[PDB]
Symmetry: T
Subunit: 147 residues, 12 copies
């Protein structure tokens, strides 16, 4: 079975993931090179803007259920399954890594949705579903770019 604290853990996992992703997306936004610079430069910004929205939405949901949203970078770095950007990525490698991150995040969300549903936290469940919706959509786009 699952309880409210289990959902808070799932919520914080995402706050952590997207806080790290927010910076990695800035890194990619700044360092991307090649013929597709203009498209990707903007696409990465659209993505980190969406990431910041998710961070705030999930963090305030944690507050709404009486929990503590991870509020330090040190904590986010410890929990996040999204790793910081290495050095020297080509445009292709950046999209490939983001695609893997989104694949991993979507998988975590499938589990988070089940946990929330079983805990009776339908609000958090709905938030995870909305996030998975956009994550899966963007991932399809990444894979198409890479095809």
């Amino acid at each position: 079975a699952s309880n409210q604290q289990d959902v808070v853990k799932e919520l914080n996992q995402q706050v952590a993931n997207w806080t790290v992703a927010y910076t990695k997306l800035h890194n990619f936004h700044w360092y991307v090179k090649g013929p597709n610079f203009f498209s990707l430069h903007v696409k990465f910004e659209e993505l980190y803007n969406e990431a910041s929205q998710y961070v705030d939405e999930l963090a305030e949901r944690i507050l709404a259920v009486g929990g503590n949203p991870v509020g330090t970078l040190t904590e986010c770095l410890e929990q996040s399954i999204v790793k910081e950007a290495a050095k020297g990525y080509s445009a292709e490698q950046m999209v490939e890594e983001l695609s893997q991150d989104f694949t991993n995040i979507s998988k975590q969300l499938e589990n988070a949705i089940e946990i929330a549903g079983n805990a009776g936290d339908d609000v958090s469940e709905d938030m995870f579903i909305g996030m998975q919706t956009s994550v899966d959509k963007h991932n399809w786009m990444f894979k198409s770019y890479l095809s």
Copy 2:
């Protein structure tokens, strides 16, 4: 649970928010103190949100062939939200809204279960959307009330 059970839950909220709509106007008008400007506006944002819920849930009832409660007398009879009493401080207004939102969120948890079991996933989704906002506002109310 069946469709009529869900209609009962939908009307329960139409009633709650119709009463809350006027109570929020009351608080909007009578609020006093150094936080007057912030709360005067906050209460208006809340009653605008309340009117949206009333129309949304009422039209969902219509969409499933039911009759939305359309008189104040009926809303007063079904609402778990009380009308404003006489004389409140800003602190007391936010405390009461917190009580109301806590009560409504609890009622919604059950409504969600009933809608889901009846196969009314649309109404279920509407209740979830409402509970989302209700819980968010409640956190804000409790934060405002915290002793500094």
Copy 3:
């Protein structure tokens, strides 16, 4: 010689009328049926949105003159000359009733305007005038919609 208190009474009478009308308009907005559904469904919403504006305007004026705006539905139902919706109304019957309500309100406003002016409350007087302007305009539209042929 009317006084401020007399004006507050007139202001609350309208707060009550429009609070009741606000919900009656939702009722008509939801229950209207027939070939004119789309137009009326929308028109009734425009009307209750306008009703809410009146309720707030007049209530805050009462506050501006040191009075107490009626803050409960129970009190509104007691003072309102606008009665709650009954069951089984056709679109035509809904418009007919709103027209009668608007005719009644406009008449009350004529008296309220006189009272406010006599009391020297020119601000409340102006608010009643603004309301009567819209009420009469809408009533002409209702009567036109209801005209035979």
Copy 4:
């Protein structure tokens, strides 16, 4: 135990339904006649604009789960439960048919929602819910427009 493939089938069923409906709504938008012309002419456009949004949303979800969205009109006509417009429909008959279509679609969506949930595709499930919400709402309006008196 439904699987992803079963959900894609449900998603394409709707892509097909709404692609056909998109054109049927243009037909009604163009051929509607009578005293309610102005309201219906516009309402039908709002409906096909909404239909186009559904087609794209569901098609891109199918892509997001690795499937193939039906990309031809021929295929859509084959799967769609929504049939093309016939000749000589009055405004009332148009609304009656759309109501029947919406009733049929809502029923299909109830099943699609169950399939998606059982398969663990909560995103597609949510999309079907959103669609059913609007379909049911519009249907209530159609039925109200069609009500006698």
Copy 5:
């Protein structure tokens, strides 16, 4: 072989028609009655706003070719093929008359277009085309509204 002067005559004919129509549309906008009041009340306003745009466009074109735009109501009433509103028109009769006016104007425009082109005034020709486009479109809507059943 038409000349610029012939085109100015065609331009003023329309300035006159639409100036008269501008007021006739206000009349219909004010006097329309019946269950279609809300839709028609608005439609007639959209039409006179469009009429005002035509009057200014064509008048300033006449200026652009060195001519004199008819600048008085008396002159407009003299040239206009659009007659002023009579009393006691039902909504249906109003739409019927506007349809006849639009049919008459479209026919005049067909000739005006030919005259402009023959005179080498391709700008005025284009303006007449734009006007005929809208006139014909509106006329189809009027005729659809008027269709029986």
Copy 6:
């Protein structure tokens, strides 16, 4: 004064502004001189304002059960505003508009008194609103005309 007396005053303005609407178009088209750009636009702003008055006052007449003048022939018969003559300088156009606005403002002062005495406070308010704009524009016209 009674309601019909007020309707007469309302129609008087519907007539005035319907004629002024076309005269302003005339001035809008025929204005010439170094101030062409400013006046060409100013006259358009004025006729747009004129159309608003016509519709507002006409619908007030409808709201009191009267018949708004709906033909140009009738407007020409009741208007105290003359149609544009042939040949004006920019200075002459503004001078005539000033004359018209002065005349209308005077007519409105009486209309306001009539409406008030008849108990038609709504029409009175509409006349006041119009007089407000009319007087403001007239000051601007006179300023433009002042010798530098």
Copy 7:
């Protein structure tokens, strides 16, 4: 009885009042301190923006009736019943003073409305009524803040 010149005097009294109030509101906007700084800082700006609108509206009405709007600070300082801001006001004292100013102005307006009406200047009368409407509304808010 009252005449047009009497109304012009009433109009100029307000142009003067609000010209001085415009600056006092800036002073309060700049010097307000305390926990309510953010709300009051903005509220005072909204008020001086409204004040500037009144100054222009009433001044141009004076022009419309053939009068001369007070156009110098020296003149406004001589006529205004609104006094310039002292030094060291607390947030509470600022609202208290504005409330007194609005009370005084509303009282002047009641008289100005009567004067204008008796002079047959219904346009100016209407302008005074519109001003009194907002002045009374804001005063209610000030008193509520102070309650």
Copy 8:
């Protein structure tokens, strides 16, 4: 040429663009490669433009007393635009759209002549407007396809 000949030309385009509307959705969904983001959006802009043409030309047919093709079966029977096949590269999608636009522009040149000769200057103007956009887009397609 007569009015019915023009209606035939108008319906030919309603058919073409109704099929193109769905093919553009197809390309919008299936496009892949490093230019995915630019083309994904470009194709959407194109189908939105396509829907505008369909409604415009269909209502022109109505305006001349004709019957606009209102079923997919009829559009497929009259369209010179083929439905998307299975499997395209980004380059192949743009190449096919270029072929379609070249074909449509040629068809429009004739439609324009027919409309003009029939005295249907309104339909002629609509065809010209469409050809304007079609030719502009085609230049862009060819530019995208140029070997670097």
Copy 9:
């Protein structure tokens, strides 16, 4: 008779005219003096903004028919019938010259429209008609300003 290349020549003639006019309008926008400075200063900007739109519209039409739009100032200066601005123009002289330029351009457009129509290039024909529409309208305004 006329062919597609003849139309391209007409299109380039206008691209050239308006490219030169764009700069002359800036010159007038900057150097205009006198009591009407504010009106003309803005009017000239509105005109060069419209000029830039025409340049792009006609140039891309040339591309659409397979031609080469004049893309250098040297070429535009060689083809343009609009001459660069002299020195010391009064406001009146500026409007007078623009009026003459518009008269000349409208005359060229009448011929360009005939050429395009005879070549079967109805799209280009329509573009010339739209340009002549605005050119004639603006010229009427110039003449009225000068009357």
Copy 10:
């Protein structure tokens, strides 16, 4: 006597100048007459709105550096090099006076910029530069209007 205090002095000089100018511009806005009425009437309003922006910006900067922004009309009239409007100007005289005021202000700003830079108050220096940019631009327009 400190450098920063000298900068505050320069900031207050401008708060004073523009507070007085704010009212003088209303005066000109109301009393301007002649064939250029419509243009100047609006131009003067655009100028006082701009002036109000300066007063607030500079006043709050003074606050940002721990100083006291002049918050009374009495004080402003004492420090301002901009004098109140005299009686009955012609439109030409109004523009001539504003041009002289702008010339005087720009000269003061040149000094203020050097004082701010010398004191290391680069923020205030930047604000003075921004003001001088607009002042000089408007002055060029005034001179052009005056021929």
Copy 11:
């Protein structure tokens, strides 16, 4: 060791400071409590949005001068003089800490401005000035809030 490299160092110091501040401001935005909740909750969001703008602006300037913008949270935490949020602050303590951070940042900016100017990097200098302008303005507000 070059002057331009010293400027990049100054630019990265700020990218680091604001990246950390971005998250600390989210923390305060989420955890703030008390009667001033509504005002501070929004104020802190306005501040982190502003912070995100700085990070991108400065990061891309570093790129414009051929440098490497710090693109990892790990790096930012090392260089930032802004420390992560501690446990359970009162609203007053949150504002007090931000005020100290802003005071520290403004002091760093004063130096960065001189370094940039000395290196002839006037673009970076201007960016630092822009940042200092807002930082100082916000700090004045924080201090006013704290009395």
Copy 12:
């Protein structure tokens, strides 16, 4: 020979550069081809719109300091270090040339900034800084596009 006249020289150099660039950017906007057509086609338009803004801003500043802004294409071609477009470039070559132009312009601006500052023309200096900021930013993007 005066310092201010040297600044006018620097201002005109840029008015000339950007007037020529305005047309070269239209050329590239029209003739660009290849898979990056859509991105570059729009990017080049954004650049010429920006260029038009510079020409007007700098031209009117020259006017603000009593100078004569170059108002003829003939003059611009003579002073501009930006050369007109050659025949048939590849997309890559277009970006390479713009990058070199931007590098050359930025270098000129560095000098112009020092000249303006030395002459005490801080307004012109600020304008040059603003231009250099955008030029350098665009150049970083061009270089990134080129790998």
